[PDB]
């Protein structure tokens, strides 16, 4: 049981000028090394305050790690505070003097003025593989790191040996629960009691996903207790509470979709057909010549995901940035605003927004890009004009002439939903609230008393 | 003098599972309101520890703001901790009971079990305009916020009136100094003494810039002292320490480049000519047909900047990412690779990678991209082959068929460096370290002329000395 406390010295973080990113790194790294972090404290550049906090933490924890305040200016007073807390006196340390002298050493006198009882630790910068400029100063069980975030990460990585607890290795499991915290709290209490000291079970909500509301976290020093509690909980919790959620969209999406295609299942065959059409799309036109019609709904969501999967594997070496065509005609829904920005961010899309009917946007697009010659469409066999549609249907004479590709032409509503949910693809949350179609504000209603249970 | 302490509750934050973002929002918000935050504290889900910190912060500071631990599980124990801290007893507050009963209220009894001395503060959620689900719980000068960052931001926005200090207004301003921290340390000490408690002066280094090393920070309740200190320091500090640097190398570059072109100066004329060639390029081919040859160096940096300005002027609508072709030295420098990575995000470029001879990379490209037909080049007329070169030159017969466009043909080394620095365009750090020309690792060395512990590249006064390194 090796514990540690952290003291971050910085006026700026308290003021709000800059955000604190050192604390997350320090905590994560120390967790990996086998050290239990018990407290964190942000304090201003004041000698008395820093000295009090150092004294308390030193008495209470095995290791103490301070970040910031060892500069050459007047506001840098960590060394002085550490001197005070331990009744030491500040003295120029010859080796730090030599370090400053090897370089320019103008006005660096304060950088070598450290507590008399200090000890130096030399290490290797992981980025350069060469030794650091200055060694790490320690006093009793207090290690004085710099505040510069890049340098802090480098120095901690270089000197992490100093903190490794060999006796302890931490093992952790994550679980996604679709129920709110209130419903499962009793089961968690019972499980924690039954297991007691062996493992720590915690819970916290994370709000922005279609597949879980709460995240359970299991922690232990050994691997076994984690699975034992997994079994206990899978039993106690109602069946299906847990979700095997994976971040797929960005990278695994390519191979995950292809795997679903090669599987011998109905949905697998539908995916295989859509992907064959999309591959032909890539073979007739350059991607600079293709664009995906995206209104925000599911059909367009699935189309975009399939196009991404196909593009990646077909064209890994080329940058292949995705282009989409977005039409607004009615005052956007709030959920739609959020989803559209999120989607373009995830996929790194190119939005050429015309506002009106699709044909109008198509004219605008012909104007903006002379190379574009074809549009991918999420039209389907359930959508009217269904008998006339072909996988490749050319644009009407009046409209601006583009050749439309309909990979999802034979896909059915049930298939769209199976495909989206099985791979955990994100979609507009309104669908989860009982709306079967995303339309204008006057157009939208809920037919059920989720959307993915409606049969037709 | 309204002071505030902050207590962040949650084991997960400490273990490293998740990062804490509540603290930045709380600190920024409280400063905007006129409240000085004196401490922040992260504590585990333990009653004793939370209660100790609560007692301490309450006795010492005007406001105490707690985030987390008011959930319905057992590991959430803020209410009980506060009860302990003030010797109070937990008793259900009927209004919170009515709230929990209004909805299903399954397992929500713990959400209505608060200290007997609790006070409720009702508000309205700024996103929905609807009243909050639950009110903000207060005990003494201790305010119990939820832990979910989205919901906490909503709640703080709704009820921030509770903390507004009318007596105080904060003024803050930052300065960019091209000097090491040690050199200005004495001047900063003297200025701070001279101003005493009128104004608060801090300094911190910022590492990723070609134009400044340190950032000075002035904080006060009035504007006058800030301007006074600006004058004091501008006088005390050696000349040129202060720089009017602005991070508009991309958004405002469009207007700036053309402004410099319209100037009747040697450099202005050079920029106008390069831009004329580039505009002609855009008039001949579509952007899908163009790409910028970019090796990371100075010439390509300036070329990309000019090309960007021209594109944003003629086609402000066209969002297309500009395409660039990168050739990798048999042994690239790491710093140059990093600068190229930083650049691809700055300008949002699309990279058509290729290695080997220019001829080889072009052979691969015409396969990867058939639609592409022309390449912009940062070549300059140093050697005779380039003096023979023309602005629009096709590739030799052997090479693959592309049209090379050389807008920078007549530019001189001094002009390149002036164009980059005057507009504060970012460039590879290696040039500042004494390299005047970046080639493969085994061929290039810090330029000896620039040694004295090496001087920047943009001070070398002779253009011919750049060529030898």
Curated annotation (Swiss-Prot), chain A:
Region listing for FAD synthase, in residue ranges: 289-446
EC number, UniProt record: 2.7.7.2
Keywords from the named record: Acetylation, ATP-binding, Cytoplasm, Disease variant, FAD, Flavoprotein, FMN, Mitochondrion, Nucleotide-binding, Nucleotidyltransferase, Phosphoprotein, Primary mitochondrial disease, Transferase, Transit peptide
GO molecular function: ATP binding; FMN adenylyltransferase activity; identical protein binding
GO annotation, cellular component aspect: cytosol; mitochondrial matrix; mitochondrion; plasma membrane
Cofactor(s) listed: Mg(2+)
Enzyme class: transferase
Biological process annotations from GO: FAD biosynthetic process; riboflavin metabolic process
Biological or metabolic pathway of the protein: Cofactor biosynthesis; FAD biosynthesis; FAD from FMN: step 1/1
Reactions catalysed: FMN + ATP + H(+) = FAD + diphosphate
Annotated stretches, region: Molybdenum cofactor biosynthesis protein-like: 5-96
Residues with the N6-acetyllysine modification: 269
Disease linkage: Lipid storage myopathy due to flavin adenine dinucleotide synthetase deficiency: An autosomal recessive, inborn error of metabolism characterized by variable mitochondrial dysfunction. Clinical features range from severe cardiac and respiratory insufficiency with onset in infancy and resulting in early death, to mild muscle weakness with onset in adulthood. Some patients show significant improvement with riboflavin treatment. Analysis of skeletal muscle show multiple mitochondrial respiratory chain deficiency and a lipid storage myopathy in most patients.
Free-text note on domains in this protein's UniProt record: The molybdenum cofactor biosynthesis protein-like region may not be functional.
Protein function: Catalyzes the adenylation of flavin mononucleotide (FMN) to form flavin adenine dinucleotide (FAD) coenzyme.
Family of the protein in this entry: In the N-terminal section; belongs to the MoaB/Mog family.
UniProt name for this protein: FAD synthase
Provenance organism: Homo sapiens
Included stretch of the parent chain: 110 to 578 of 587
Swiss-Prot record, chain B:
Full-protein residues shown: 110 to 585 of 587
Species of origin: Homo sapiens
Effect of substituting residue 421 to C: In LSMFLAD; decreased protein stability; decreased affinity for FMN; reduced Vmax; decreased FMN adenylyltransferase activity
FAD synthase: annotated segments: 289-446
One GO cellular component term: cytosol
Record-listed N6-acetyllysine modification sites: 269
Protein name per Swiss-Prot or TrEMBL: FAD synthase
Function of the molecule: Catalyzes the adenylation of flavin mononucleotide (FMN) to form flavin adenine dinucleotide (FAD) coenzyme.
Record-listed N6-succinyllysine modification sites: 269
EC numbers, comma separated: 2.7.7.2
GO biological process, one term: riboflavin metabolic process
Catalytic activity: FMN + ATP + H(+) = FAD + diphosphate
First and last residue of the signal peptide: none
Disease annotated for this entry: Lipid storage myopathy due to flavin adenine dinucleotide synthetase deficiency: An autosomal recessive, inborn error of metabolism characterized by variable mitochondrial dysfunction. Clinical features range from severe cardiac and respiratory insufficiency with onset in infancy and resulting in early death, to mild muscle weakness with onset in adulthood. Some patients show significant improvement with riboflavin treatment. Analysis of skeletal muscle show multiple mitochondrial respiratory chain deficiency and a lipid storage myopathy in most patients.
Gene name of this polypeptide: FLAD1
UniProt keyword annotation of Nucleus present: no
Region (Molybdenum cofactor biosynthesis protein-like): 5-96
Keyword Nucleotide-binding attributed: yes
């Amino acid at each position: 049981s090796v514990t540690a406390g952290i003291i971050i010295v910085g006026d700026e973080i308290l003021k709000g000028h800059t955000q604190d990113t050192n604390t997350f790194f320090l905590c994560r790294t120390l967790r990996s090394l086998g050290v239990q972090v018990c407290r964190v404290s942000v304090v201003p550049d004041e000698v008395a305050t820093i000295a009090a906090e150092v004294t308390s933490f030193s008495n209470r924890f095995t290791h103490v790690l301070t970040a910031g305040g060892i500069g050459p200016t007047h506001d840098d007073v960590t060394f002085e505070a550490v001197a005070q807390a331990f009744g030491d006196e500040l003295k120029p340390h010859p080796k730090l003097e030599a370090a400053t002298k090897a370089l320019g050493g103008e006005g660096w006198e304060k950088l070598s003025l450290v507590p008399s009882s200090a000890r130096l630790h030399y290490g290797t910068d992981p980025c350069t593989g060469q030794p650091f400029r200055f060694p790490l100063v320690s006093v009793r069980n207090v290690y004085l790191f710099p505040g510069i975030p890049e340098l802090l990460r480098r120095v901690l990585e270089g000197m992490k040996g100093l903190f490794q607890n060999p006796a302890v290795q931490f093992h952790s499991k994550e679980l996604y629960v679709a129920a709110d915290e209130a419903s499962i709290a009793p089961i968690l209490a019972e499980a924690q009691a039954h297991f007691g000291r062996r493992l720590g079970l915690g819970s916290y909500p994370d709000w922005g996903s279609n597949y879980y509301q709460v995240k359970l976290t299991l922690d232990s020093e050994e691997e076994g207790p984690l699975e034992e509690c997994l079994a206990y909980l899978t039993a106690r919790l109602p069946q299906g509470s847990l979700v095997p959620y994976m971040p797929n969209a960005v990278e695994q999406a390519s191979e995950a979709v292809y795997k679903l295609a090669e599987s011998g299942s109905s949905l697998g065959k539908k995916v295989a057909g859509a992907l064959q059409t999309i591959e032909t799309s890539l073979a007739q036109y350059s991607l600079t010549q293709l664009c995906v019609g995206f209104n925000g709904g599911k059909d367009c969501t699935a189309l975009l995901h399939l196009f991404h999967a196909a593009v990646q594997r077909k064209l890994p070496d080329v940058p292949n940035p995705l282009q989409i065509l977005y039409i607004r005609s009615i005052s956007p829904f709030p959920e739609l605003e959020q989803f559209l920005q999120d989607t373009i961010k995830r996929y790194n899309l190119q939005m050429l927004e015309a506002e009106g009917s699709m044909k109008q946007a198509l004219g605008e697009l012909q104007a903006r890009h002379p190379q574009l010659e074809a549009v991918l469409m999420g039209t389907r066999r359930t959508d009217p004009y269904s008998c006339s549609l072909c996988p490749f249907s050319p644009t009407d004479p009046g409209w601006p002439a583009f050749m439309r590709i309909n990979p999802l032409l034979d896909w059915t509503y049930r298939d769209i939903w199976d495909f989206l949910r099985q791979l955990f693809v994100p979609y507009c949350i309104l669908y989860d609230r009982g709306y079967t179609s995303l339309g204008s504000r006057e157009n939208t209603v809920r037919n059920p008393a989720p959307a993915y249970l409606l049969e037709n």
